[PDB]
Design a protein around this ligand. Sequence first.
Ligand code: CTP
Ligand code: MG
Length: 443
Amino acid sequence: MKVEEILEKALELVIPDEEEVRKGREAEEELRRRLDELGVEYVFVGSYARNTWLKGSLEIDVFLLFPEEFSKEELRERGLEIGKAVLDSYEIRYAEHPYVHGVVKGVEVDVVPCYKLKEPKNIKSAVDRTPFHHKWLEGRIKGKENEVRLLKGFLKANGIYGAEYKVRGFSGYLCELLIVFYGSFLETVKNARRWTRRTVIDVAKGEVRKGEEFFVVDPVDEKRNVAANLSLDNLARFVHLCREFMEAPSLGFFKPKHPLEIEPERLRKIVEERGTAVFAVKFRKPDIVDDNLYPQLERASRKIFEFLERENFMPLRSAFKASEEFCYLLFECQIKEISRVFRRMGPQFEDERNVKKFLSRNRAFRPFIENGRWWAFEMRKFTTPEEGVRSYASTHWHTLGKNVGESIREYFEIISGEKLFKEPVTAELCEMMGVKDSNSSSV
RNA sequence: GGCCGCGGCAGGUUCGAGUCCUGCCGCGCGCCACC
Ligand SMILES: Nc1ccn([C@@H]2O[C@H](COP(=O)(O)OP(=O)(O)OP(=O)(O)O)[C@@H](O)[C@H]2O)c(=O)n1
Ligand SMILES: [Mg+2]
């Protein structure tokens, strides 16, 4: 359990076994065979072309390079055409930039169309930097392949690996740049402890400077932030893990933690012990890609959360879950019920023109003067969070994200109490409420 | 699809809105994700 003895035992978890590598090289050989037959200019990129892919996560990436003059429509129609021809089975489902996900001799393959650029300053597509990323990294990452796999596995085990909107973590390319900048996994962790939200890491200049936000400068484009989609919280979660690790190293930092089935009875006791209002908004999952869904679930959850605050239900945290059929927006509040009456502010006693208008309004109770101005007692239209959210989600369905809001419009329901604990949201509830010992890394 | 702006324009809430909530439109190949 020394710092180095543990990184030894952890390499056995992140390094692919020779039975998987052979399966990868065999698929790579067949892929080049079919691609060469089509006479298309292509290039292998990603973690596979650099031998930095994690164990159990084998995926080959192939970029097809087309002329600059091609329309975005022509790029797609030709890209998808080649892709379908090369892959055994394929699947076309993307958010913006077209590509083909499929299989070749049993391995995951992605055939991505892009432009054959010279100097990637003003890229035309989003993915035109990727060949240039591979060209810059192949010569510098050599020898340090396992130092990347330690960093990737370290993050994946703590659920902050990936730049996708489902994660908002560290892209696999960001990890490689960090190893080139620090040399080893150990040196990244040591230095990561003193990162801040202002840290700028310019790999191209071998410099660490201060800036406006966390910014890892892309060697290929000094305007591009490689860590653009790394949330501030996940940045923090990483720094916290590094300080914890150096303070007390362990192999568990690399073991993926999975949730535990919590009894619906134990959960009912925890919520009762807290005395908070725990409820959820349930609606049909819109049939869209995760990268469109999660930003909207984030938005919807925020809009309802913000509503609860200004309505004085004093919310604690928010959360959401996406099952196969349904989406859930979870909330916890300190106020299960508020009075119907509240005090609305009136004008100062001086200018009677405003006061006369203020006092003319028919109210159930008599207004009063306090500290030099008038006040009135008015009634609320709802006195609980559930009743409030019911109203908001019904009327303001449109502002909860395009697809989510349109799904909430057609139907939604607020689930509370025990009826909630039978839903697929136990894990999300325990994370939200800070329940202890609801996770484990037992194999 | 989400996010950030320069503007706006109207509407709702209010004694009172350039200031809180909402809807619509323009412009930065604006930024990010799908690789
Ligand atoms: N947010 C992202 C994600 C990736 N890439 C580019 O996409 C390539 C590979 O895509 P991806 O599969 O997403 O990352 P991998 O390096 O393959 O990581 P992993 O295999 O673990 O998924 C990288 O070379 C990188 O230049 C990028 O610039 N921006
Ligand atoms: Mg890959």
